[PDB]
Write a protein that binds this ligand. Structure first.
Ligand SMILES: Cc1sc(-c2ccccn2)c(C2=CCC(C)(C)CC2)c1[C@H](OC(C)(C)C)C(=O)O
Ligand SMILES: Cc1sc(-c2ccccn2)c(C2=CCC(C)(C)CC2)c1[C@H](OC(C)(C)C)C(=O)O
Ligand SMILES: [Mg+2]
Ligand SMILES: [Mg+2]
Lengths: 131, 131
């Protein structure tokens, strides 16, 4: 289904990377945050919900969505309840940037634009077709 | 054209709001940043470029894109060179959130989901059709 996203945290250079994957397309969005936190999770989900039609969200760590503040965000937005590929691309471009967050955003761009249509294309098409 | 975006800063409660508008749809993305800065502008544009097919970017303050670091970002991403509506929605929801950034993201969501198809729909459709 086009409304299903996966959301997980990974660690790199002592920082946290929140990664969201649109399961049907392989499209990703990601952000660097100081540490795993219900507030960070909540605010990311607000941002995500505001650009795409997010219906459900899965994770690999159920306890991530336990906090009151994450549930409140899912309520308001009407939400219900790739590390290796991305980590790879970050290594290739890490040299070209100072900050990890910049390398993340470069990799996310590399990821979504690559062809096999690109992930970035498939999300748009899948979502348009389902309108 | 579907690759044209507008990018501007506005001020509210002594903070800065970077606002991007996809001109053909009225879709917006926005972020709260400490102060107007070439680095902030640059990093936002990386993020934007990574989710949409951004071809050109306009602004109301040409000097915003003057810095070396903003030009470098446009180069790497292959980019070339609503305050009142959004400000309104922020006032309506300001009460319901502590942080300005949360109120921004709530308003951006309100904005993109409203019907007259919604802005969020029109971006997806416009971009899908042009694939
Ligand atoms: C802190 C800086 S300075 C800087 C830069 C690069 C070339 C010329 C001037 N500044 C950059 C870059 C801008 C273009 C790229 C492709 C996004 C990667 C490197 C950065 C970059 O951080 C920003 C994006 C917050 C500014 C970084 O982490 O290295
Ligand atoms: C700092 C907090 S705590 C908190 C909250 C709300 C209800 C229950 C528990 N926490 C919230 C909210 C979560 C849901 C909404 C719809 C996004 C708005 C209010 C916030 C919110 O900041 C976050 C998003 C960084 C956590 C805020 O600025 O008020
Ligand atoms: Mg750093
Ligand atoms: Mg605040």
């Amino acid at each position: 289904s086009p409304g299903i996203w996966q959301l997980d945290c990974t660690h790199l250079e002592g920082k946290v990377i929140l990664v969201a994957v649109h399961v049907a397309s392989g499209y990703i969005e990601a952000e660097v945050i100081p540490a795993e936190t219900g507030q960070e999770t909540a605010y990311f989900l607000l941002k995500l919900a505001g650009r795409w039609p997010v219906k459900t969200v899965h994770t690999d760590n159920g306890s991530n969505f336990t906090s009151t503040t994450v549930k409140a965000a899912c309520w308001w937005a009407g939400i219900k309840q790739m590390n290796k590929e991305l980590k790879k691309i970050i290594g290739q471009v890490r040299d070209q940037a100072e900050h990890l967050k910049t390398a993340v955003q470069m990799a996310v761009f590399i990821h979504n634009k690559k062809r096999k249509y690109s992930a970035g294309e498939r999300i748009v098409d899948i979502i348009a077709t389902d309108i």
